[PDB]
Structure formats: C-alpha cells, structure tokens
Design a protein around this ligand. Structure first.
Ligand code: GDP
Ligand code: GDP
Ligand code: GDP
Ligand code: GDP
Lengths: 414, 414, 414, 414
C-alpha cells in the first residue's frame, strides 16, 4: 500500500478493511513509463498487505528493469541477445514473428508461460479481469507490443479485455508519427469492432485512457511546490504519475469499499462503463472543499477542463458517463438537491448526459471535503490528435528551416 | 513525565496538578519488551516531577539492561554466572527451584529483598496496588517468570494482585506453542479461581491485557507517517508502545484528575473493573473529532474493531464494561442524550451492556475533540487463540514442506 | 511564472487560462535595482509558459548583468570601453551626446535597434503598451537615463508612454540631491505637460510610482520571519521586491482574468487610471481576512498608511482613484452594502472620492479572504520630498560636524 | 591485538573491555598459508592484551616457520629428518601411518601431546570450542592433513568440531585436481553425516568457508591503493588476509561485545549457525555509508556478489541465514522499518530467507557508517567447482597444445 494522497490516507486511515477491489487489472507494464507506473501499481497492497494488482513488467533487457522497487526479476521479462536496437517497434514484432525470427514462437511461449505463472494459481484460472496495459508512446517497445497485442488478443492469448493506458508525449515529430499511426490503427480497430459486434457487446478493447504530458507539466508547475519542500526536488513525472495512478487506483477502491446513504456507484457500473464504450474515456477528480453552486461549477469546470487526463476530447463523441462524488456525510450542502440538479445541468453543457447512458454516485465519507469523480466514455478522438498533427508539422518544418538555413551555412563557407 | 500525545499534552498543558493517579501499579518489566515498556512507564513523573509508577526491571544479565534510559542498575536485576542459555523458560524456574538450583532460594531472597527495597518505604508497607507485569510472549524469561509468578503469588511474595500485559507475537510456531500453553495454563487458572472463589471476590489475577503485534503493524503503517517526518525513521514498536502505554497511562490519570459535570467515572470503577473480571480485558480509545451519530458509530466501530488491543475477542464472553468519553465541555452535540442512547445501543450490538455490569463516564475537558475510552472485561479467549493455533500449524507444515522438498534435494544430488 | 504569494498561488491554482494581461509593459530595467526587478518581471510567463512582459536590461557593462537569471546577454545591453566611472549620470548623457561623445549616436542606434529587435516582431509593430522604466535613485545610470528618456520620448524613440518606477533611497545626502533634483525636473515636466496638453490627454508620462526603502525595511522587519525560516536568511530587498512587483503584476492579471458578479474593474480603467493622471500614483493591497467594518477600516487604514508604496503623499493632491476588492464570492459580509458605504466613506476621509474620478471593483474569487487593492492617482509631491530635504540637511550638517570636530582633531595634534 | 580496520579501530577505540569472544577457535594453521593466517589470529589479544585464540602452527620443518612473528618454535611443529619431499600429501599420511612409517604413531603422540600442552590448562580441559583449521589448497601438507583430520576426528583426538578454512587457488591443473578431489571427499563426508546424523545434530564438521584467490586479486586491485601509499608496496595476499581474517575475527567480537537496542544477534546464533549447517558457508560485510534503499540494495548486492568469500555458490542450496548490521544508533534511516523490509526482500531474491532458518541482528555502534554482515550457510557446492573443473581442463589441454606444438618442434629439427 502506498498512500500518497490525503485522500488515500483518509481512506486508509479510516478503513482498514481495504482488502477489496473492484477490478482485477492485470498490469502489464511496457517501456520505461509503463514499468514505472507498474511499480506504483505494484505498490498497492491491502489491509493485510496483500497486493492489489498483479503485474508483469516487460522490457527488452534486464538492466532496463533495475531500478524497480517492487518488481522482481521474474517479473522482469526481457529478451536479450543482440545489443542495441533502433527503437523501432519493428524490432519487437520480429522477435515474435517466425519469418524474421524463427524462434519467435519460442519467446511467445515464455510469455504465455509467464502469463501462466503469474495468472494462474493452480486452477489454471486466469486471475485477471482486464488487462491493463500501460504505455508511453514513442516507446518502440510499447508501440511494437501494442500492435502485438492486437494480434494476440485475437490469438486468444489474452482472454481478458485490454484497457490501454497511453501517454501522449510532447514534441519530436518522429514520435508523433509513430504515435499517430498507432492511434490511427487503434482507432480503426475501435471502429471496426462496434460494427463488428453489436454495440452492446463486450468490447475486447474496453476503452482508451490517454494522458498528455505537456499539459501535465504545465499543470504541475501550476500546483507549485512550496506547498511542500521536496517538491522542490521533484520531477514532474514523479508527481504526475502519482496522481494518475492514484486516481485510478482510488476509484477502484472506493465504490468497492464504500457505500453511500444515497446513490451508489458500484463495480458493475464500472464494468459497464469500462467495457462497452470501447473508446476514449476520461476522468475528472475534483476536490470540492468550497461549497457553492458557483464554485461547484467552477471546480467542475476546472476539473473537466483542467482535467489531468484532458486532451480536448470531444465530449459529445462520448456516449456514456459516470463518476461519483465522495462527499462527507455531514455535508448537507450536497444533500440538497439543487446541487444535484445543478450539477446535472452543468455537465449537460458539454453534452447532455440525459441523452446518453451513465450514472452517478455520491458516497459518503467522512472527509472534510469532497471529491467528484467524473468520467466521460466512448469518445472518439481528441482534438489533440489534430494538434499533434499540426504541431509535428510545425516542428518538422521548423527544423527543415534549420536544415535549409544551415545548408546555407555550408554554401556560405568555402 | 513524557507526553507523546496531543492529548497528553492537552492534559498536561492544562493541568499541572497532575500529581495524582488512580492505581499504583508496580511495574515489573520482564524481557526485552517488558523492560522497554517499563522505561516508558518509568518516564512518568508528576507535576512536581514525581515518578508515577515504581518499577523493577528484570532481566537475566546486566548487559541486557543497558539501553534503558531510566532504569538504574539497581533496578536492573539480573542473575548471572552462566553465559548463554537456551531461551527455555525452564532455565528460569531452575534458578529458583532448589532441586535444580539449590541456591534457588538465594535468589529469591534478593527478589524479595528488592521488592522490599523498592516497595517499602520504611513502613515496610507495600507501596503498590497491583502488580503490573509486562510480558512479551516467546520470551523465555517472561514465560519462565510467568509461571513463576503464579506460584509466587500463592507463595505470598506477592500480596498485590497481578495484571498481565501480554503481547501476542506474530509467527514462529515455537513461540506459538510456548505461548499457547502459557495462555492455556493461565486460562486454567483463571477458570479455577472464579469457582475457587466466589465471583465477587478479589481476583488475585485481576485481568489480562493482550496485544497483537501483527495487527498492530498493520495498523501502524496505516497510520502513515508523512504526517510526520521522523516517522519516516521509526520503528513500529516504538510507536506502538507509545500508544499502548500511553493509553493505559492516560486512563489512569484521567479520572483521577478530571471530573465531568455529568457522569463520573472513577478509580473505584477501575478497581472494580480491573480486579474482579479476572480475565480478558480490552480497551478502545476513540478520537472523536467528527460529530454525528453515524460517525460516532463509526469511530466506535472502528475503535473496537480496529482497536489496538483488539484480538478478536468474543464480546459476549465479557461480563463487564466500562470506559468514558473525554469530551469537551462545550460539546453540546454530546450533551445531547440521543447520542448517549445511540452509543448505548451501538455497543449493545456486540453484546448488550445492559445485561452486564459496567458503567460509563463522560468527562469534560476542554479539548476540541473527544476521546472515547471503552473497556470490555472478563472475556475469555479471543479468536486469535485459535488463529494462532491454525497458523502455527500452517507454518509448521509449511516448513515441513520445505523440509521435505529439500530432503528431496538431498536425494536428488549424489 | 513565479508565484510567490498565496494569492498568486491561489490564482494560479485556480486559473490556468492565465495567458492574459491587461497592460503590456515594456520593461526597461536600468541599474542594479531595475535589473533586479526586471528579472522578476521576467519571471512571468503564462499558462502556457509564455512570458508576460518583454524586457530589456540595461547596464553599463556586461559583468554588471551576470547574476541575472532570466536575462540573456542579448538583453544585457551595455556600453563599454572605459573602465570605472564616477557614477555621475553625466557619464551616460555623454555617451549619447555627440558633443562629448561623437559616436553618441552610434549607440543610440543600437538602442533603437534593440528596441526594434525586442519590440517588433516583424510587423515592425511595437509590441508594447507602455514603457515601464524601473529605477532606483542615486544610480547614476538610472538618473542619466532618466533624463535621457525625457528627451528620447520627445525624440520619438519612444512612442509608448512611460511609467516610472522610482525607488526613493534612504540616506546619503548626495543621492538625495541627485534624486531630488531629478524629481524636481520631472515634476516640472509633469507640471508642464498638463497645461501643455489638455488635462484629458494621453499623458506621455503616465504616472509615477515611488517606493521608500526606509519605510520598507521597517515594515519588513515588522513582518517578522519566524513565520518562515528562510526568512531567517533573507534580505529585505529580496522580499520587498517580491511584494512590490508582485502587486503590480498581480493587479495586472486580475481584472483581466477575473470577473465579478458585481462591479467590474477592467483594463480600461487601468488605462485611464494610469495614463491621464500623469502623476503620482500609489497602491494599497489589503488582506482582509477579518470581517467587520471596524477592522475593515483598520486594514484599510493600515493599508493606506502603512501602504508599501506609501510616502506621505498628499491625498487630496490626487485627482483620481481606483482599486478593487478581490473578495470571495461566498463572502456575504461584503455583499452587504453597508460595507460599501462604509468603505466609501472611509476613503472619503483622506479626501472624498466623490469629488474626483475613479471607480472601484469587487471581484470574486474563491479565496478565503479578500484583498483590497486601492489606488490613488495624480497626486503631486509626497511629504517625504520634504523629509528628504530635511534629512539630507540633517545629514549634511551632521557630518559637517564630524568634519569640524575632527578638523579640530588635526589642530589638537602636533 | 592488531587493528587494521577503521572498524577495528572504531571498536577498539570505543571499547576496551574487549576481553571477550564468542567462539574459542583452536587455530591450527597448516601450510604456508594457514600459518600465515595464523600469525594474524595470533595477533589478537584483548583489552588486557590477552590473546584471543590459541593456535598451533604446523609445518613440516622448522625453517618453514621462521618468518612467523608470533609463533614460537613450540608452536612450530614440524617433523623432520628427510630433506625434500614431493609435496604429495601422501607424504604426510605416511608419517602417521604405521604401515609406511612405523613410528607413525610416535608422531601422533606428540601431536596429541602438544595439543594437550596447548589445550589444556591443567584441568586437562580442552580450552577450545571448535577447531579452526586453516588451509590453502594445493598445499600437500594441508591436503594430507585434511584427510588426516577426518580420520582423527573419528579417532577422537579431536573432540571439538572442525571448521575448515579453505582457500581455493587459482590455476595449475594439478592443484586443481588435488583440490577437487579433496573437496569431493569432503563433500561426501558432508553428505554422509547429515543422513548419518539427524539434521539437527551437532555436525562434527561445522561448516566450510572457502576463499577464491583469483577473485580476490581482482578485487584487490579494484580497491586501488592510492588510497594509501604503502599499498603501493603491497602484496595482495597481505591485504587479503587482513580482510579475511579480520572479518571473521570481527564478527566474533562484535556480538559478544556489543549489543543493540533492537535485534540482537548472539553467539548462540553463531553457534547454531556454525555447527549445524555443516556445509558451505559464506559471509558478506557491507559498508554502508550511504543511506538509501537503492544503495542499500546495491551495496547489498555488491556485498554478496562481490563478496570476498564469494565463489558463486548456489544460494538456494543454503538452508540457513544470519548476519547483522552494525549500525550507528543515531542512524534513523535504519531505524525505519521499510528498510528492514526492504532488506528482507532484497535477500529474498537469492532465495527467500523466510523459507529457511536464520536470523539477523542490527547492533548499535556509534559509528558513522554501518556495516552489514550477512551470512548464508549450509550451501552445497559453488559453481566455481565446476569452473575449476572447466578451467583445469582448459589448462590441461592448453599445454597439451604446447606439448604437441613443440613436440612438433622436435620433429621439425634434425
Ligand atoms: N510520464 C512518464 N513518461 C515516461 C516515463 N518513462 C518514459 N516515459 C515516456 O514514455 C515515452 C516513451 O519512452 P519510453 O517509455 O522510454 O519507451 P522505450 O524506449 O520503448 O522504453 C516518452 O514520452 C517518455 O518520456 C515514465 O515513467 N513517466
Ligand atoms: N512490541 C514489542 N515487542 C517486543 C519488545 N521487545 C521484545 N518484544 C517481543 O517480545 C517477545 C519476546 O521477546 P523478548 O522480549 O526479547 O524475550 P526474552 O528473549 O525473554 O528477553 C517477541 O515477540 C519480541 O518481539 C518490545 O520492546 N516491544
Ligand atoms: N530595493 C532595491 N534597491 C536596489 C536594488 N539595487 C539597487 N538598489 C538601489 O538602487 C539605488 C541606486 O543603486 P543602483 O541601482 O546600484 O544604481 P547604479 O549604480 O546606477 O547601478 C540604491 O538605493 C540601491 O540600494 C535592488 O535590486 N532593490
Ligand atoms: N592468500 C594466501 N595463499 C597462500 C598463502 N600461503 C600459501 N598460500 C597458498 O596456499 C596454497 C598452497 O600453498 P602452501 O600454503 O604453500 O602449501 P604447502 O606447500 O603445503 O606449504 C597456494 O594457493 C598458495 O598460494 C598465504 O599466506 N596466503
């Protein structure tokens, strides 16, 4: 268990029966980023110190996996032999493709194996609910795997659905491409399946969660760090991560361990919520320590807008909503209805919930502020896609410039 | 005086007439643990810096007693000669048993003596109320003494009753046994006496207070320690201890030095409370800084459940209740009756108080939160006993496994 | 972006759309002081980390400009050749005066140039609103430039108005003089223009903001610094500065990014406010975390009196008022009218606002206290001028004393 | 007393009551190496300059024993007559075997005798705890004796157990053989006894400590010697030795003379530790002067891996663990629990301690760094055995080559 939020604390300080989750994610962490996250996920144990999620970490080589603080070598999968690579994801693919790599398959086995190892007990049962695959884009490894997975799922190695945690980078046109295309492909896929399935079907691809780094850094600095001191010694990712994960984590806990005396969110919701939309999903966590409609709105707005996962996704491309407000039970001001209404309406502004599926919870806690967790799902494409698009152009060219300028510098010299 | 709680502080900051206790415990601290505790007890002095409890520390050898910060060598009793021992408590027994150790008696004298030294003044009067013997189980020394005491009491060396502070360890089947049996014997004894006495009789064995380490550690980490920094440098016991003792300590102080404008707990209560049940006793200290019935309940629940002394004792095997809520006098919300009722009822759920003896206090302070001290007494057996039972089996076997597995490893090699 | 106030934080934590200012100051920082400030100004970037003001730093030589943390050499203008100088501002003047320095003009070009560089984009457009020239008096460089500017403006190199940030020193008669005369000249100028213009005219000299160091230090120590620890390691200027700038800075932000649900201050106001009075302007920022008329008054009073910019300026020599209270929107106590009235009246005591121009805002925030920004403009002469006058006399003579005394010491010895 | 480590110093500088050991080794030093070591052991005296271990030195002839700096001729046992020998250990055996050497026995007597002389006082009591026999392999003398001992023990001349200090050489196939076989035999023996005994039995062969020279030299040079100057004049063994012995030595001292305020290692542990595993034992001493989990790990790792005694022994062939960290008592960072855990886990990676016996201490000192002594016991076979195996083949053949090549050189010439 790693608390790392007031909240978390609050929780933990309060309940200690926390031994219980909603969804058994099978954390496969790929690439620096993923791994890194994974360790955090890894950090969760219960109120009996029992891990929460089961986690494999993958990376190409061993060394790659040294700084992990929870992962053991066994869970450090790597495939090794050749030194160096071109960070093309095409390396990866090879290694499992007979044609390039005959022993392709050899590897696969071991994956299948370790999967077995890790995800069976001895019922041979998969002890997983959905695969949570974590990726940071531009990471060859990730990218390679990404696709890989798509196949694999098909190839039934994966019989749980996949949830994709994708970070959208910042800069570097190359990455941009890699990413975009990656996203594209996915997107296709996404599109295919709904019409390939019904639309009430378990989506093998449950949803996609994206994060923008850029945005985040900005945010991060926003939040200053004279509010603490070691802040003054931190890395943004390091923080970022915390939030991110925590959120997720948290929300998994909360319904499970909490109740309300009024509307009750629940796992199933989540399940629903997570599977079926199949697409782009976003979450807003809003501290609410100030108590009025206007501010409510603000923080709402803020939370959405100045959401952490925010990517300028196109709200009305959502189809489904969710979230809940964990509110103190003495917090009358919320008990009031107007509020609710207000809220409703508030949200309605980005698209009216009431045209789509979703629900909302309002749990109790005994905190001294409330946090509103908000989730919009099944969206398609965030405008960032575009922005990215534009930007890498605006980059590409920008160093074309630099290329031409200084091609001139060649000419200019004897 | 060592404060080490807000409370304690609060107290101390408030009253300074604290020169006064309810019960004169005679702290005999046996074994690492006991000693350690003892030092803390030892740390108490009055508002005139006058010690609170008188304390002997026992250990086998001198060195054993070095790190103590309050104990003087004089109060470091040890009996020495042979180097090393098997940590069998059977060592101890010998030393006072003529048959094994002829000079058995020689020692006894010195005990009797130092007891004299320490517990008489020069009225020859025992300046004690009840012996508080502190033990951590699995400690040969403790264990040896434990039994020893039973005899000794009989042997009238002890003319105050004994209260046993027992820690129940965590792991190691051996200990487990030692313990269990120890507990067993005690248990017997306990059983005997009530029927050996009346049931309205001064129980020579006033009660037993157990603590589970395991539980505690868990708890401890629960309580995080980013709430403080040096926390980030602490040992659980170190904290644990603090609580534990403090509690006790505290509660001894409080009635004595406090009043109420309503129901008044008092020493006698305590006395009653402590003597007669003769058996398993538990305490819940509940911060109440949140003010509603539900939360009241929660914290109640919490406190019981996620009590510190908690061991899954069998509530209805209690016979007697007590405790008090030290509440701020401006704290109207408590003044209200409903509350009381509520409380009553709340407790009623684990067994209905109103079928048994006990009482309850509600003192004032001028704190800005309240703490509810809750005591259930005269219980018999906590399910942990069992759990322990199961566990050591689950251990024993588990390393039988390891024994057989690797007996195989012998066979497997040439 | 550098936050450095709760407020700032509050702001920043709240809005992150802060990408937007009211007035584009063109910060020219002259002399140690100015530079220093400039760096701070320089520290501002937006919610997209986009600088706020554009800034040139001037100093005589390069080295002079080393410790700057944001200024780049390019923005470190210096003119160099001769080593040492007499800190006469008459050095400066020379350098741009053909007669003394034929290549006078050469320099000017570069100024004009860098001005170009810095203040055009490629529309050749000036990207500035008003020049904010920062000076600490007694600084030869500053002083030289001061005058220089007056000319330059005339000489149309400056086509934005100038706002002068002048610090009034503490001690040293020489400085005093330099200053006074400087002030005098300015004063003249000020006087001229109004009658040289209409009085409804864009004043090329928008206003003057003075700061007294002396006063400030006093204040500073007032504010203690056990309230923080590093305080215990600070320099007054360092703090001072922070305030000062911040204030300014802040106020530029706030209207721009904030609204109210009631009276709305706005840039134009500011503009008006800043241009037309042409003269002495002062600002009071009042935390209001205590909620009553009396205290309101107090803090008001305090703020004025024990304003930061305060110089014993002659209120009724003002002609124009402004400011706004950034108040929490839940802060009902302000919503109330009486309050307003009260305020009005309060201010009325130093001169009645209602005889002059100005306005006042009351924005919302969601802070948990309010800050009242108060501005009195178009004043002429603060009594400090005088005080200064007296003091340097009281100095001059005082070391005349010392001169005569110890001229005696010459005589007294063989 | 010879200090020769900071530590040792630290110790000695601190305590001077050092008059006290854990285990009375009876140092029999055989062969150059052993002797050499012995002298060092010999160098230990107490804080009252009282020798620590009692030591016989054996060698074949007198001259052999000249450079010893502590050994007296009396303790220079040699058996002499014939000049030269074939360094076959078979020489040795003869000398005590009636059949080859009738007067075999004559010698034996003298051994028995001097043993008597040296190891009785006049209680006729053996003043020994365990025989510490030191050997460097390939040393005929050693080797001969090795076996000899096995018999002798059986032959009850030895009634203390034997601990074998074996150096594994570097190169020379012959040695290799001699060694291997030696090791083999031993190994057998080892295997026999456990099944010959119970497994909870005092192993007559307490354990085996091996050292690799090769490894060591490498290490040695690693540690540079511009860190000192005379280093620049040293022999590796000379250093090596120091460490080695010292370690041992040290660890014998430390528990004995130190305490902790927390977990306490102790002799018994050692005893246990040393006797019962009967097999391969290894030790890691880790300076810890850097304070974080990662580094902790590192040094841990390092220490294990880049242990001094390290031989690529097969961790999981261990059965038993031990060690302790002598840490400064002000060293909070260790006091913290996480740490502990971490550690635990860390170790767990090579095999999980928690499946096997052992314990761990954490003593105080007042050093300004900590040293972690780590012990893995009861292992069987280190991969070096193998490596050796391979290598001598790789040698044997390699000079077969040279043999054939240059057999060709014969043919090639007339
Ligand atoms: N925020 C964050 N991004 C990371 C982290 N590690 C890597 N990334 C990002 O993930 C993307 C791909 O890099 P990486 O994960 O190293 O890919 P790899 O080279 O395939 O291992 C880049 O945008 C990295 O900045 C991480 O732990 N957190
Ligand atoms: N929490 C706690 N347990 C302790 C302390 N010292 C020892 N123990 C525990 O007491 C039990 C018996 O150990 P110990 O007191 O050393 O017994 P001894 O060997 O007879 O001195 C074990 O569970 C120890 O962990 C202490 O000061 N606090
Ligand atoms: N508060 C403050 N005053 C300063 C600072 N630097 C210089 N001054 C003051 O400005 C006045 C003129 O000094 P300076 O700026 O060094 O002039 P220069 O010699 O022309 O560079 C003096 O009163 C200095 O104390 C600064 O950064 N802050
Ligand atoms: N490190 C070390 N090895 C030694 C020393 N003396 C001898 N050896 C080694 O011990 C092994 C056997 O040689 P030695 O002791 O001379 O055997 P002997 O010929 O029977 O006396 C070889 O590997 C030697 O290098 C010593 O004092 N230290």
């Amino acid at each position: 268990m790693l608390l790392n939020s007031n909240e978390l604390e609050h929780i933990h300080s309060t309940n200690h029966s926390v031994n219980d989750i909603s969804i058994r994610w099978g954390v496969i962490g790929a690439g620096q980023k993923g791994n890194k996250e994974a360790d955090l996920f890894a950090g969760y144990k219960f109120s009996n110190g029992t891990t929460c999620y089961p986690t494999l970490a993958v990376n190409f080589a061993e060394s790659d996996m040294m700084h992990l603080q929870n992962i053991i070598k066994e869970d450090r999968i790597h495939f090794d032999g050749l030194k160096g690579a071109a960070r093309t994801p095409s390396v990866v693919t090879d290694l499992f493709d007979p044609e390039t790599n005959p022993n392709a398959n050899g590897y696969l086995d071991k994956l299948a194996q370790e999967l077995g190892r890790k995800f069976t007990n001895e019922e041979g049962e998969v002890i997983v609910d959905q695969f949570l695959i974590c990726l940071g884009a531009g990471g060859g490894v990730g990218t390679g795997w990404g696709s890989l997975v798509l196949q694999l799922i098909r190839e039934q190695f994966f019989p749980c659905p996949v949830s994709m945690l994708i970070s959208l980078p910042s800069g570097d046109p190359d990455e941009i491409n890699n990413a975009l295309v990656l996203l594209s492909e996915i997107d296709e896929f996404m599109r295919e399946q709904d019409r390939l399935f019904g639309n009430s079907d378990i989506k093998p691809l449950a949803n996609v969660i994206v994060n923008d780094n850029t945005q985040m850094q900005r945010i991060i600095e926003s939040q200053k760090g004279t509010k603490d001191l070691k802040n003054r010694y931190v890395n943004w990712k390091e923080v970022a991560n915390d939030n991110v994960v925590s959120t997720l984590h948290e929300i998994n806990i909360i319904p499970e361990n909490y109740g309300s005396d009024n509307v009750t969110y629940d796992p199933s919701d989540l399940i629903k919520l997570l599977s079926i939309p199949g697409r782009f999903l976003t979450i807003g966590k809003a501290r609410i320590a100030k108590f009025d409609l206007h501010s409510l709105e603000n923080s709402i707005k803020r939370s959405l807008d100045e959401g952490f996962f925010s990517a300028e996704h196109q709200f009305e491309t959502a189809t489904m909503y969710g979230g809940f407000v964990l509110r103190p039970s003495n917090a009358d001001f919320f008990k009031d209805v107007n509020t609710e209404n207000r809220i409703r309406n508030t949200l309605g502004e980005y698209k009216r919930l009431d045209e789509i599926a979703g629900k909302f919870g309002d749990p109790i806690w005994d905190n001294e502020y409330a946090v509103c967790y908000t989730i919009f799902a099944g969206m398609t494409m965030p405008k960032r896609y575009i922005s990215l698009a534009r930007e890498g152009k605006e980059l590409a060219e920008k160093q074309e410039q630099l290329r031409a300028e200084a091609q001139r510098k060649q000419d200019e010299e004897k």
